[PDB]
Amino acid sequence: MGKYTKKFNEVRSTDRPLVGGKCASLGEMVQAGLPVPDGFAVTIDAYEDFRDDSDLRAELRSLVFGVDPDSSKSLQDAHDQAVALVLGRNLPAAIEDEIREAYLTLSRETARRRGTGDTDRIPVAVRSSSVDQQETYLWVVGADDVIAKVRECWASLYTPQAIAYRAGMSETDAAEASKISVAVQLMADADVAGVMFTVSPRTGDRSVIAINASWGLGQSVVSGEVTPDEYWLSKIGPTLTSSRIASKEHEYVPAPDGTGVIFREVEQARREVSCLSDSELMQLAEIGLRVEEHYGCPQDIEWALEHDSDGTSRVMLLQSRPETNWKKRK
């Protein structure tokens, strides 16, 4: 059937009926040639056919429609019971196996691409996706945890707040507002990571690109636990105009078992070397231009770079927002 998961490369914008907003979002981006972490959507029908396999639907509705919406003890109660069922009832085999298979596919493809161990335990993020509250689990490892966290996502539909808000609506609306999708995406396993601005934070010059980069996970650069290398390009060209290479003393990497990060020392030989090649700056610079023309304002981008087993450098776009000062001023 194939009804329950869809790879990101195949999700379009016009798939909002089946994957929701966040996921059709990520779909248009890949489509616009913006390289977001690879993964798949768990489609709205995974949750839908779950609640329809037994009386589960009637009972959750009953619970939501039952509540004293001005009593907190009423919301707690309904929340508790609702969640127990959402994590508890049997998941239909067709749903479970497809989610399992989609994850194994991602893990094997990735282990091939990264040229790392094919151990079916690739770390992923799992994040909820309303059809029109964000739940996020990071560093999820193995098919069992993916299934477990996908269910947690479905359960977050039944917070005190979320219940109270649907308890109001017409049955139609609550049914439509109970639809959910789930995104399963690679955690980065960055060789180099960092941030990029398509405007100078300092001057508000919108004709330059600033990249701050360090070894391993972007966390060391985002949290200021390392002194990054700094590069400046002009957009016209693009032309590299300036670099400043630091002693990069620490990095974060994935934990071996994939469940967290670990802080460690960058060994001598790598500390004072430039962590981005001239071709990689140009890759990054080009993605910044794409990303900024897509959104239509200057960006503050968080990126990662992986070197694939064959050798090609692959840039991942992890997050992106308007650059704050440009925005503050405006």
Residue numbers in the entry: 1 to 132, 143 to 340
Question: From the publication, what sentences describe this entry?
Answer:
Crystals of HpeI diffracted to 1.8 Å resolution, and the structure was solved by molecular replacement using an HpeI AlphaFold model (AF-A0A520FAS4-F1-v4), with the N- and C-terminal lobes as separate search models. The ATP-binding site is located at the interface between the N- and C-terminal α/β lobes. The motif comprises β-strands 3 and 4 and their joining loop (V124-V150) located in the N-terminal α/β lobe. The motif from all phenolic substrate kinases more closely resembles PEP synthase than PPDK. Notably, residues 133 to 142 comprising the conserved loop could not be modeled in our HpeI structure and are presumably disordered. Another notable feature of the HpeI structure is that it is in a more open conformation than many characterized grasp domains. The ATP grasp domains from RPH and PPDK structures were shown to undergo a hinge-like ATP-dependent conformational change between the two α/β lobes to enclose ATP. Given that HpeI was crystallized in the absence of ATP, the crystals likely represent the open conformation, and it would similarly undergo ATP-dependent closure upon binding, though no crystals of the nucleotide-bound form were obtained. More particularly, the structural data indicate that HpeI corresponds to the ATP-grasp domain of RPH while HpeH harbors the swivel and RIF-binding domains of RPH.
Catabolism in GD02 is initiated by a two-component kinase, HpeHI, which catalyzes the ATP-dependent phosphorylation of AV or HAP to 4-phospho-AV or 4-phosphoacetophenone (PAP), respectively. The structural data indicate that HpeHI is a two-component homolog of RPH, a single component enzyme involved in antibiotic resistance.
